[PDB]
Amino acid sequence: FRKMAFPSGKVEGCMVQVTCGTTTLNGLWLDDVVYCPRHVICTSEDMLNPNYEDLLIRKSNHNFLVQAGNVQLRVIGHSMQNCVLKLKVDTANPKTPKYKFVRIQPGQTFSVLACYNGSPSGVYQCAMRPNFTIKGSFLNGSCGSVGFNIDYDCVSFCYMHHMELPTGVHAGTDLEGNFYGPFVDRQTAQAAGTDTTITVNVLAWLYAAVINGDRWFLNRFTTTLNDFNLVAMKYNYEPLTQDHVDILGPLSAQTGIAVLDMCASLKELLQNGMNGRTILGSALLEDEFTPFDVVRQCS
Amino acid sequence: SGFRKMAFPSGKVEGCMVQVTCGTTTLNGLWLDDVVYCPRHVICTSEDMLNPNYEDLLIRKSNHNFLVQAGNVQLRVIGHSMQNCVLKLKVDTANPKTPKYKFVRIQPGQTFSVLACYNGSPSGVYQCAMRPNFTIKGSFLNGSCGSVGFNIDYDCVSFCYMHHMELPTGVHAGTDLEGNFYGPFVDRQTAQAAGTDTTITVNVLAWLYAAVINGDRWFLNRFTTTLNDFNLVAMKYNYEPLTQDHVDILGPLSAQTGIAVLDMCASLKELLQNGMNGRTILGSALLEDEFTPFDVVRQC
Numbered sequence: 001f002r003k004m005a006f007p008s009g010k011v012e013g014c015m016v017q018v019t020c021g022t023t024t025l026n027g028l029w030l031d032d033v034v035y036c037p038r039h040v041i042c043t044s045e046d047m048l049n050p051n052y053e054d055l056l057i058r059k060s061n062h063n064f065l066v067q068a069g070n071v072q073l074r075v076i077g078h079s080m081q082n083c084v085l086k087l088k089v090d091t092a093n094p095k096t097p098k099y100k101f102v103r104i105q106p107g108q109t110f111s112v113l114a115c116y117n118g119s120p121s122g123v124y125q126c127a128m129r130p131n132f133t134i135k136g137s138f139l140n141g142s143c144g145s146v147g148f149n150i151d152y153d154c155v156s157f158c159y160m161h162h163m164e165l166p167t168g169v170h171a172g173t174d175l176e177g178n179f180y181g182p183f184v185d186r187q188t189a190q191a192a193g194t195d196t197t198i199t200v201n202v203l204a205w206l207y208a209a210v211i212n213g214d215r216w217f218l219n220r221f222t223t224t225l226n227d228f229n230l231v232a233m234k235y236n237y238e239p240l241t242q243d244h245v246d247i248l249g250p251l252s253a254q255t256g257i258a259v260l261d262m263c264a265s266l267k268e269l270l271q272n273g274m275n276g277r278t279i280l281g282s283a284l285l286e287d288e289f290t291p292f293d294v295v296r297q298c299s
Numbered sequence: 300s301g302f303r304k305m306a307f308p309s310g311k312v313e314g315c316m317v318q319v320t321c322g323t324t325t326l327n328g329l330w331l332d333d334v335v336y337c338p339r340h341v342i343c344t345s346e347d348m349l350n351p352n353y354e355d356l357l358i359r360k361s362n363h364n365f366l367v368q369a370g371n372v373q374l375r376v377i378g379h380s381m382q383n384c385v386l387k388l389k390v391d392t393a394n395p396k397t398p399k400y401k402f403v404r405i406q407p408g409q410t411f412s413v414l415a416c417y418n419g420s421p422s423g424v425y426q427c428a429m430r431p432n433f434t435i436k437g438s439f440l441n442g443s444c445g446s447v448g449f450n451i452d453y454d455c456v457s458f459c460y461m462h463h464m465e466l467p468t469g470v471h472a473g474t475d476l477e478g479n480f481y482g483p484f485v486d487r488q489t490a491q492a493a494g495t496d497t498t499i500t501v502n503v504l505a506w507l508y509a510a511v512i513n514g515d516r517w518f519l520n521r522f523t524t525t526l527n528d529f530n531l532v533a534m535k536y537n538y539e540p541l542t543q544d545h546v547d548i549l550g551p552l553s554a555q556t557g558i559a560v561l562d563m564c565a566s567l568k569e570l571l572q573n574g575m576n577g578r579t580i581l582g583s584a585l586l587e588d589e590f591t592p593f594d595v596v597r598q599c
């Protein structure tokens with residue numbers, strides 16, 4: 001198995017740079033709107049604790065420099081939506097794909113197109129942790145880089161980058177500007193809650209091992225969802241939701257192993273350990289492949 | 300700032316991918332200027348594949364036997380020829396989206412991005428290294444042939460890999476864009492085995508430095524080692540020997556962290572002999588060897 005990203009070209013075609021004074025980050029150019037983190041309007045001394053509404057009233061359209069490459073895009077309107085700035089521009093992006101804005105759930109994966117000064121550098125796959133951080137690779141200048149999934153021809157944008165925390169993980173918002181998790185776009189002291197293991201993805205991984213013929217760990221028993229959830233929390237696993245049960249549907253049908261039977265098999269691994277064995281050639285359970293990622297790479 | 304296995308943005312390559320059909324075989328082609336490149340085994344039937352006389356099979360083919368599609372559009376093949384294991388299909392049109400490009404042959408231990416395609420449509424992108432035994436550990440299913448691997452320096456795409464086959468161990472094999480295989484493989488429908496794989500030592504060392512740079516250093520130690528004594532232990536565990544050029548290439552990481560290369564070698568030597576006894580590095584229970592020194596630096 002591999003951490004596989006979506007091809008990034010449809011998103012590369014939407015990346016621009018937004019500058020206020022000397023502050024330069026990335027923005028997302030879709031139709032005739034550019035989306036970017038509102039803190040582009042902050043000075044350093046203002047990042048310590050900004051009054052974004054007061055900073056915005058002092059702004060005019062002609063204080064924003066939007067560039068695709070080195071070509072200026074004139075700004076003809078501005079507004080703030082939560083923690084994102086929306087800049088109306090005078091040119092509709094001819095490379096605009098079919099798109100949607102979606103707010104993902106913890107555990108869901110997405111590709112990140114890491115960008116600096118509106119220029120993409122790399123693409124990689126991230127899982128949204130249960131504590132609403134992601135394990136990214138972002139340097140200064142990376143804010144406004146986006147995360148997305150591609151469904152057929154349609155790009156679903158789910159993440160815009162805003163921050164690095166002390167523990168080295170990253171945090172950001174959806175494309176409507178709402179942070180994932182409890183964080184705020186201020187240069188004040190913040191910290192991610194303790195993380196947990198993404199149970200639904202571990203379960204997907206067990207299904208993947210079974211599809212590939214590796215099935216020593218299946219037992220002859222089942223469990224209730226609440227029983228499994230109460231046990232899982234004692235091992236710092238995320239409790240399953242009904243949505244998790246539902247998205248394991250295809251893998252359950254592909255293998256003939258009901259979700260709750262796989263849960264009983266996982267519970268036994270949690271309670272008894274691996275006892276020296278491996279699954280898909282590893283003593284560790286993997287939690288960064290969703291049910292969809294598994295299908296993608298097997299079928 | 301975090302360390303992640305990262306592929307190049309794939310857009311310049313997406314704009315070159317097309318579908319190529321001959322007979323009952325569809326796979327991917329790479330359309331640069333007015334030429335489409337693809338694996339030549341697209342011309343084979345079931346029976347052909349076990350011992351295909353490709354020069355023989357190719358001369359019996361017409362330009363009109365090749366259906367090339369770029370999305371909703373068929374491109375007219377006006378000529379065909381073969382270079383080693385790659386078929387070249389001249390078309391009446393030039394690809395407008397052709398990037399600045401070159402064809403390169405990579406060395407084992409070097410890394411590249413793979414754009415996995417099916418029916419000419421990009422499906423995923425990921426990073427691979429050319430293994431010392433000239434396989435690559437990819438994710439490729441039926442219909443992936445013609446998927447390409449590449450690097451990008453500035454705005455120049457250097458193409459280095461085109462996908463042809465899976466081995467029974469689940470690793471992958473293919474050619475450069477001149478059609479020459481990496482390794483001892485052949486585009487005939489046989490189960491083939493690779494030579495013994497070995498671990499890319501200079502890459503494990505780059506990764507360990509990355510693990511330090513990101514605030515992880517449990518595996519470190521106060522011991523040191525000569526280069527030759529490290530190499531003796533490395534070879535015992537089927538790790539590649541480290542050359543003085545590899546040492547040099549690791550300087551920037553050495554400098555950046557103030558850990559002498561040979562000190563990181565003594566750390567690695569300890570891990571090889573002792574295992575990780577439960578512990579992990581940058582998340583992994585295993586020593587990762589598909590990050591080059593450049594990949595680590597660029598990302599730090």
Ligand SMILES: *[C@@H](O)[C@H](C[C@@H]1CCNC1=O)NC(=O)[C@H](CC(C)C)NC(=O)OCC(C)(C)S(=O)(=O)c1ccccc1
Binds near residue numbers: 025163165166185187
């Ligand atoms: C894009 O503007 C940039 C991207 C960062 C830079 C390095 N890696 C990244 O991902 N984002 C910022 O600089 C943040 C801007 C604020 C308005 C949100 N600042 C930031 O991330 O600062 C971190 C905090 C909030 C000060 S922290 O999490 O408390 C912290 C403290 C000390 C050390 C690390 C983190």
